[PDB]
Amino acid sequence: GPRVTVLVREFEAFDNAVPELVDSFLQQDPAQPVVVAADTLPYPPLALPRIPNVRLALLQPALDRPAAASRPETYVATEFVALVPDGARAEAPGLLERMVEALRAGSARLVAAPVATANPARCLALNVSLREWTARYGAAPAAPRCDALDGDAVVLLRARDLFNLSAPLARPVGTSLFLQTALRGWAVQLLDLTFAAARQPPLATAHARWKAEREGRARRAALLRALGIRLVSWEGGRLEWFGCNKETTRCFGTVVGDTPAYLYEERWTPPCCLRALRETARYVVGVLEAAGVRYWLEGGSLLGAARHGDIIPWDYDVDLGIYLEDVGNCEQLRGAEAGSVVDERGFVWEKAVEGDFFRVQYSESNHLHVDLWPFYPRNGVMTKDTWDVEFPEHFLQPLVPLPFAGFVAQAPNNYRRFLELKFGPGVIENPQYPNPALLSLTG
Amino acid sequence: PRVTVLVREFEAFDNAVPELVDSFLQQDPAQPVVVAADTLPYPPLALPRIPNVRLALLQPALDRPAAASRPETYVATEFVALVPDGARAEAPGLLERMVEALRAGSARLVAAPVATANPARCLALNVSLREWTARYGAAPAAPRCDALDGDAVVLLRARDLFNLSAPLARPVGTSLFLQTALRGWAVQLLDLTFAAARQPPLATAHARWKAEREGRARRAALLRALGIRLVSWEGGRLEWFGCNKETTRCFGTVVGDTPAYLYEERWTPPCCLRALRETARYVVGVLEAAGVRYWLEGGSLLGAARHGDIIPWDYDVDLGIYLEDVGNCEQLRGAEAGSVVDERGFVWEKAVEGDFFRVQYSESNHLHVDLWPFYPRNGVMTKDTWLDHRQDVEFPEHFLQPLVPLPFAGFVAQAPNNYRRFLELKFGPGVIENPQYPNPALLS
Amino acid sequence: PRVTVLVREFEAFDNAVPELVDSFLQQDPAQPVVVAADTLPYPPLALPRIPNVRLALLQPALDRPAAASRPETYVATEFVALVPDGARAEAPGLLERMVEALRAGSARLVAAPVATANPARCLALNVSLREWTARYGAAPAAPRCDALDGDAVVLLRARDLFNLSAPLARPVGTSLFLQTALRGWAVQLLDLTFAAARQPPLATAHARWKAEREGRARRAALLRALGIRLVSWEGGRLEWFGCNKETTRCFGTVVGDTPAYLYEERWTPPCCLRALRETARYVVGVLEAAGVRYWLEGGSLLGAARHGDIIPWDYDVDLGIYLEDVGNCEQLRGAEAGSVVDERGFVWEKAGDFFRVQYSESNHLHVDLWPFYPRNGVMTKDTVEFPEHFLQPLVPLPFAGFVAQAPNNYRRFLELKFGPGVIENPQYPN
Amino acid sequence: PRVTVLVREFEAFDNAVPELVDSFLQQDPAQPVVVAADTLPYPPLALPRIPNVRLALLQPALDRPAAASRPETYVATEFVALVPDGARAEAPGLLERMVEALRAGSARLVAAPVATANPARCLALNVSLREWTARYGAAPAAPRCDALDGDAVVLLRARDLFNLSAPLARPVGTSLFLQTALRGWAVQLLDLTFAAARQPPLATAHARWKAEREGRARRAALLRALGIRLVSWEGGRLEWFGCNKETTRCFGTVVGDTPAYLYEERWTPPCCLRALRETARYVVGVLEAAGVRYWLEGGSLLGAARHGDIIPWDYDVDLGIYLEDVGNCEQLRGAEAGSVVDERGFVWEKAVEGDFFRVQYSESNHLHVDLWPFYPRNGVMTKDTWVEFPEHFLQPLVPLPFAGFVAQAPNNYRRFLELKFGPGVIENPQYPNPALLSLTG
Ligand SMILES: *[C@@H]1O[C@H](CO)[C@@H](O)[C@H](O)[C@H]1NC(C)=O
Ligand SMILES: *[C@@H]1O[C@H](CO)[C@@H](O)[C@H](O)[C@H]1NC(C)=O
Ligand SMILES: *[C@@H]1O[C@H](CO)[C@@H](O)[C@H](O)[C@H]1NC(C)=O
Ligand SMILES: *[C@@H]1O[C@H](CO)[C@@H](O)[C@H](O)[C@H]1NC(C)=O
Ligand SMILES: *[C@@H]1O[C@H](CO)[C@@H](O)[C@H](O)[C@H]1NC(C)=O
Ligand SMILES: *[C@@H]1O[C@H](CO)[C@@H](O)[C@H](O)[C@H]1NC(C)=O
Ligand SMILES: *[C@@H]1O[C@H](CO)[C@@H](O)[C@H](O)[C@H]1NC(C)=O
Ligand SMILES: [Ba+2]
Ligand SMILES: [Ba+2]
Ligand SMILES: [Ba+2]
Ligand SMILES: [Ba+2]
Ligand SMILES: [Ba+2]
Ligand SMILES: [Zn+2]
Ligand SMILES: [Zn+2]
Ligand SMILES: [Zn+2]
Ligand SMILES: [Zn+2]
């Protein structure tokens, strides 16, 4: 009895070669189990053979079906599942068997065989970091052992592994599967086997490709947002973003009890939010330097600068100190005492509700901000008559350059002494990343 | 008797879940409680972090197994009680009495109203997926109902709830009884009342307002996902959830003369049918006012002869008109120059394929009436271009002299005389008495 | 028919808990499973991280609420099945069959042996808190039993298990039936059989010996915490869990002639009585070797007359001796200079009219020797008296495992000292 | 009546609990009073036989229901006042004063010192479970505190006290504030004083000696059970409660390579780090005096470059050495022939596994410094078992602070570290990830 169930999930209803795919596997073994899975009944009809080992699995809730009907493991009775993309065909007999033999003999929980299309599967490296909401892809250093595949491959793994993931069949499978398996530390072995292409390949015209790719990028975008992947990178670069921006709200919205929503989700600050914070800091610093406002990294920004030259990865704002006596040198600041001011580049400058400090928002919609805390000497010690620690004014005589958030910012001289006076001894050396369990106990 | 309290209906921005859960914990410190949500609620729910109170997140996640989003794996007890936000346990032993009534009764669900401004009421409910409709009315055999409207604790066996396809789809008040009534199950409305929340949620008019809107949006999403286009109540009042003048038609381009919904074992959506009847009514009024001779044709005449309406799986309307009359109608005259949007938003155009005219419900909604021009050759009605149908044939002009009245789509339409013989000539003997799909070589 | 599997008996260093849990999950993927432990097991159990399988850590923690160590809070179902490591579910439906037998029967617990090397056998069990003793034997009414010895799945209602004072105290097979036998509950040893793990734990000789040694340590700590100083078996085997030659005695300094165990509504710990009997026998032996005239006195004579033993709530032994003979005994001559620790560890002291022999330097259970002298034909000390004819002659009287010497006509002698009817009217503590 | 007096800190052999109970009853005969003990106190306390005075025995017993050992079972008021032995109620209207203060302020605990020789002082306290440390200090915001030192009545809500995991674990003065400070709760030390008992307990040197021996034993057992390996005062006066030269290391055999402490969502116990630092310093001392070229390697060099210490979740130290130098060191030459215990108890052995050397802290405590011999071939440092690196990184070695002393590091160690670990590794620590560990294994 067959030990592998072919499963087809990646195809387009308007233009596919799924009937040829199914027919090709049935022509090596008429009893071969084949499952085609879809969110709704594909139209135009697929007209697959009406035989018991071929089944359409409709992954949608329906008023007249049991819970089992929308669960893909219901449709698989074999030990192994072979995910087969549309556009493949089985011509050499026994390829699924060789893949089973390779899986059992190897040490990778997945094995794959490229399909000989215009885009055969390439072996990739992938690091998934849920805390940084990032998926980092790269060339696979230990090919043919990989974390992920790009392109067309028959992928074979045990049904109990596949159907135990949270989103076994979320689309595109080429993205969702390896996000889940790579996070788990599993590997995929690119075998030296090749499945043939369909004789009449799907999506043969430019217009059909255009529709297919438009829908698939839309599925991918929605998939990465639902799964909490805000940034995709290739070799550290070619950033592809899925978070907040100048024209949207910031990811975590309004903060309740100075504990942003992302900490309860056991993650750190989204990288789109950190990116806007860096850009807003660079911009405010550039403006203050050109206007003649003396400023220095303050608080957690200074602490992040001194520790690793960037925003601390679970922080969500930037704090700078300024000489109160110099506020008038800056137009945006001058206007900020009157009322909120939207400058020429969309940055919003406000005088705070209470507490006498200035706030610069990334944009009118995206409320990530830099806070400016004005101080004035009172006989050698900086003070704000509203309350951020009081400190001696010689720490600013003079100020020091310090790498921060991708540029050079000004800091208090001997910032190490400055940091422990405000935070306590040894602060630079002992970071404490968020503690969700502790947070769960203490609200 | 062990019962898990399961909380699904609440709002993250404004709720009384902490009070709800504490009220059951005051009665039994080890009381199992499951709060279910699609995403982690923020601001934090701050439930007691004790092992018998769990939060079930129904979203997929990269670092969780499939079971973590299946709520049955959080319920170990035989029974489960769905409790809405705004409710509280005050009297001891309420859930136990509900268990007793379920074991003693015959209904598969029992329910207790909550003493909010809107306690649950007993309702009747018929679901027809084929017609995309759910029909509510007054309960004939109260306190035994098919569905409830309003706030109630609903107790049923875990095995029964979690074998539904969408046990926790929101609103539960709508979703649950749609699934239970379809299965012939009854909910027995008990004479027990749960108390309301001391600090009820949604205390301000603004908070209430943004809740009713988010609920309506969820309810509409629910009915679209489940294929309910039309909801009716006794009193005759209707809520729609499909087509209108401003949207697309529900089903899209038809291949093989068999629309997508037939493969889904459903008939034409009632909203598409409504648009087709209103377009047929309008077009007939225009042609009559213009002096264009028209007759019901094809499947429209067939439907007319059978039951005075569109065939319930059909998706367009067909009229024959005299060719020499097209010049009488302003929209028709324009349609030969190009597509014409007229005074009521109907779109008239000469079709790609067969030198016939098409009238679309709107620019976005392409439900249409097709007008087929005919001219008499020698007492024989005919045209130059033919579509590849067994229904597209010549026929004797005497069938059009004279035309007879015939109810169709809510109005009186003109039909060929002896339309039975007419229909049998075009479709074959007995067509009126033998309904069949537009092509049974594919689907019958 | 919803049953939570509850695993408590396993060793972190060597266990088959992953197989056990997986076997029940094959029969039902949503089977509730609770694995209970005092601390987080390492190496990791690596249980499935699915909502119906949970690890309950029972010790206190700075960062957890009270509820987190209370096991009932992890069990929502009506029934619980305690499953020992080494067992696996093969046939489906075994727990529901056990539930049915439970509802059908009259035993508050039912049990099914596991086909290990040591499948559960039935036992009788009698618990006497007053005497700090648990007594096991062969069970007359098997398959209905007070306790079990060996591997079994035990099923009971969760309200029954978790109202016990120490439901999951280890070892479970000792602690559970101690608590249920004391309440009059019975266990029915059903005829069902759970299979053994396909890869059993403790496969090597070193592993098994390491497990037996830590188990004996847990068993000993359990019996000490619950007040079982002695486990006795039908056939004579005795297991001691109290004081001995190298420890302190169990109760320490008595105030107001009422030892601590009386206020706990218990009698003398049996290990303390055993030490007293052995000191009495040793002292009598030394006295008889040195030719010292001794007789039973006070409560020891009373207990000898009543039942040939120490009164079970007494805590010392009193002997009278002829003062003229004190010199014939080395230990007692030495006792006048100072404390004497002899060959065998006994501590002889004079303190005070009288001498006192302690079982050992650490264990101060003692025999008091009170010397008398004949002056009037009456026996008298110098800091109550009785006529000398009660000692001429002395009679043999069983006491504490040996033949002691007692005044002649000692019943008459006991009612001179204590009043009439004393032998038949024991002054029971209340 | 809204406050239940709860007495937990006393000694059976010598106490003033009868005077205490009486004093509260003299001011209100109906006062709820609970004396809590693990076992029946002997000699008998002889407390009044009235319904509002109860003796709670918290140990499990064969004849008692579960509830009997749960302290909330004995309390039916909203508040609990923890009262130490030695205190006495004289001024009426004192507990109601503490309730009024509690309600009107923000602290969930309020306290009043008792006028003994050791009246309560206000302290700061941070608890770090990851570092297994309790850091005490003088309270910056007195009389708002994190913890108390000395005798005080402590009043808080019953629901708060009996929700803690170990609400009456002894000593209370230690156990309570470890739990409340971890939760971020404060205690407010009021300007109210409870009088002392007229006949104070433990008045003799001998009675005090016994009580202090017992209390210290209870506290050491309490700290081990709760995972506090290290107590400090103002960062000094260190008190240790973990492993040492004469014991096992805290976590024993690593099977991951994921030590047990990561599964407990903590870092390396600080006693283990202390042993590792001292072994690294001793080994380095031996290598320098014997003339062995060594350098910090792997995560030791990485930790030195990041913050000059062992990475706080790492559990060993790695050093490279020149293989041609091994002969210069007696311990190493002995290690090739068999395991050698040297004059100070360190164990030098040659793991035949990976062809390196390993120095253990002691025969029992297997925290170790690993020594990786390299040899050059064409100016590339290499070895025969396992990355290799160019020798110029060792020509010359540079000083680098590490673990309390100055150690040798490759020159350009940032470039050295980046080649081995990747760019940015110094700036982006791989912080322990409980959630992920729970997923991968
Ligand atoms: C993934 O992580 C490893 C180890 O942290 C690192 O060496 C590698 O360069 C990373 N790969 C990518 C593509 O980010
Ligand atoms: C008990 O403590 C936990 C913190 O782990 C908290 O979640 C819960 O709300 C507390 N309950 C009460 C009644 O304070
Ligand atoms: C529901 O269907 C039943 C069965 O024919 C019918 O008697 C009843 O009138 C229907 N009720 C509603 C509200 O449509
Ligand atoms: C399902 O996934 C979880 C990981 O989150 C794992 O613990 C469990 O063992 C998996 N079950 C199977 C059958 O692989
Ligand atoms: C327990 O009690 C009965 C009498 O009530 C006694 O006959 C039986 O022997 C005792 N059990 C054992 C094991 O001795
Ligand atoms: C003890 O038994 C009673 C009655 O069955 C029940 O109310 C209570 O929950 C039980 N205690 C537990 C299960 O801890
Ligand atoms: C506790 O932490 C705070 C800030 O984290 C620090 O300022 C205070 O100095 C610390 N106190 C002690 C005694 O470590
Ligand atoms: Ba900050
Ligand atoms: Ba038609
Ligand atoms: Ba038509
Ligand atoms: Ba006596
Ligand atoms: Ba390392
Ligand atoms: Zn963002
Ligand atoms: Zn429609
Ligand atoms: Zn004893
Ligand atoms: Zn240690």
UniProtKB/Swiss-Prot annotation, chain A:
GO cellular component terms, semicolon-separated: cytosol; extracellular space; Golgi apparatus; Golgi membrane; nucleoplasm; rough endoplasmic reticulum; sarcolemma; skeletal muscle myofibril
Residue numbers spanned by region Zinc finger loop: 244-273
UniProt effect for mutating P398L: In MDDGB5; strongly reduced secretion to the medium; localizes mainly to the ER compartment
GO biological process entries: adult walking behavior; basement membrane organization; bone mineralization; brain development; camera-type eye development; connective tissue development; connective tissue replacement; creatine metabolic process
Tissue: Expressed in the retina (at protein level). Expressed predominantly in skeletal muscle, placenta, and heart and relatively weakly in brain, lung, liver, kidney, and pancreas.
Cofactor: Mg(2+)
Residues annotated for CDP-L-ribitol binding in this entry: G300, R307, W314, D315, Y316, D317, V318, D319, N430, P431, Q432
Disulfides per UniProt: C123-C146
Record's keyword terms, sorted: Cardiomyopathy, Cell membrane, Congenital muscular dystrophy, Cytoplasm, Disease variant, Disulfide bond, Dystroglycanopathy, Endoplasmic reticulum, Glycoprotein, Golgi apparatus, Limb-girdle muscular dystrophy, Lissencephaly, Magnesium, Membrane, Metal-binding, Secreted, Signal-anchor, Transferase, Transmembrane, Transmembrane helix, Zinc
Protein's pathway: Protein modification; protein glycosylation
PANTHER family: FUKUTIN RELATED PROTEIN, RIBITOL 5-PHOSPHATE TRANSFERASE FKRP
Complex formation: Homodimer; disulfide-linked. Tetramer. Forms a complex composed of FKRP, FKTN/fukutin, and RXYLT1/TMEM5. Also exists as large multimeric protein complexes. May interact with the dystrophin-glycoprotein complex (DGC).
Name of this chain's protein: Ribitol 5-phosphate transferase FKRP
Organism of derivation: Homo sapiens
Gene expressing this chain: FKRP
